[PDB]
Symmetry: C4
Subunit: 176 residues, 4 copies
């Protein structure tokens, strides 16, 4: 089991290196963007990487399906004018997504003045071959990847995180 806990954590760590531009171990809770170009770059790197996955990954990952949802969230209405010290805000959070299908989004225009966050969602399928070592049959994993560029604090600093969730089932038909 814990060798499978390590399988989820190992795969997630790999995802951070693969999809998080400029990521390096130990940076998890300080990793963040501070400029618009930094943020656009991080977003485009994560999607491009997703699209190049078959050619660059050291793991054999399979796409699931639309494949990737690039979503930005912002206030339905956001007039923020710190200069004349006022604002007119409608707190309802609106979601705008761009679907990306692997068999191929850069026109993306973020509404920085009232941005709540940006998320990139997608799933990846992989076989836990390691199980073969213990003479067991490999599990069929489905990873749910969630990359978040959180701006909920509206503090000029946008922390970036990558989390996952694994769905373990039994592969259709194995052969060992």
């Amino acid at each position: 089991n814990q060798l499978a806990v390590t399988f989820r954590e190992e795969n997630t760590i790999a995802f951070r290196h693969l999809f998080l531009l400029g990521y390096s171990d130990g940076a998890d809770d300080t990793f963040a963007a501070y400029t618009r170009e930094q943020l656009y770059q991080a977003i485009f790197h994560a999607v491009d990487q997703y699209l190049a996955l078959p050619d660059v990954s050291l793991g054999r990952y399979a796409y699931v399906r639309s494949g990737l949802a690039l979503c930005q969230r912002y206030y339905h209405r956001g007039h923020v004018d710190p200069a004349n010290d006022t604002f007119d805000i409608d707190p309802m959070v609106v979601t705008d997504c761009i679907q990306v299908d692997p068999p191929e989004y850069k026109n993306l225009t973020l509404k920085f003045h009232k941005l709540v966050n940006v998320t990139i969602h997608f799933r990846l399928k992989t076989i836990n071959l390691q199980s073969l070592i213990n003479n067991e049959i490999p599990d069929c994993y489905t990873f749910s990847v969630l990359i978040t560029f959180d701006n909920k604090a509206h503090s000029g600093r946008i922390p970036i995180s990558l989390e996952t969730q694994a769905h373990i089932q039994e592969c259709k038909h194995p052969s060992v």
Copy 2:
């Protein structure tokens, strides 16, 4: 409150990344310049960034007003000649500032031989939108930013720091 303590600290952290050339988390008490070009570069980066703020920041900051004071301080009289082992000094500290107005200083010439320090001062206005999450009304923050290139130790090493101070009041007229 502490979520507002975090609002001041989060904004300050963002300022360190935005205005401190080559800055990275964890470097706070060792961050420093050691060469003249390093120092000129740090100074010009902080001002250029200040001027580009509207186009590069992930936060919606407003200028306040002159906007930025680039000041160097040096001894009224400073003949330092370690070679012939003497010096003639008048300890009175003279301040020379260059005002920078956003709607636009590189001729700056530092008096290295008797430099006491260089400071960059400016204020930024921002709304604490986060307060909307707790169903409260957003505060109107005025950040006072102070970047110091301290040479008071005259030790060949010039530590660089960025500190801030927040003035919290109530925005003119809000709308939620």
Copy 3:
């Protein structure tokens, strides 16, 4: 003795800097590859360095003999198809090596879909001159270097490590 423990550890540390592309102290247990080009690069750097050893090393190392074994290991049979949720695997591990003789492998093609690991093996001979300080006679060391690109976890992350083993004997004929 412990000064000889330090001789083995010092030499090994040097090997990590010499043969591990992008290596830096303190990275030992997180050091890894995540892309195919990263892995090919690490492998080619270690071999090229090995071949350039006489011209770049600060230590006087001697080749031993074939000199270097660049081996990749993979499952005898590996059809991994996470997309259609199946696999057909023959767990027997097959080893394919490429011998490299110093008096000179880039056509290498890794079988990523069923890669178990890659290893680079070679020996280096060196004299422990340090022993001269204590007025003793220098030992004759034979270092066995093993660079492993371990993919046994099939988790998208390939940790890279460099270990050694020393064979201490008495040099043929010394002169001090």
Copy 4:
């Protein structure tokens, strides 16, 4: 006093950044060279920096006098042949120095096969202006800088260190 302990340590820290190529805080006990080009580069950087000191330093340092001694040390006789497992060594350590006078060594050819170490020695004069803050009269410091590329362990790894020693006296004639 301790503010003067800090004056010596602050100046030394500055020297590490100024003269040690690729140096960064916290690297003190792992800082080292591993290749011949790395070592030649470190050596030439330290001398070039020394020569450019007046134009690049943030401190007002004065040369003392020849100014810089670039010395390499090696065994009087060193035939090291790990391949045919023998050696013929005369442990007497020979010193070969190149004097560098500021009013201006790259032909340097290190005897890597029997190198004991390389050292760079020079003195710098500076006034402790800080003393003016406490209303005291500034001391006249003479820093003795010693950069060592130690190969005494003959282990393929050459640790590099920079140490100093301060001679405090009273400046000829001060004026405050």
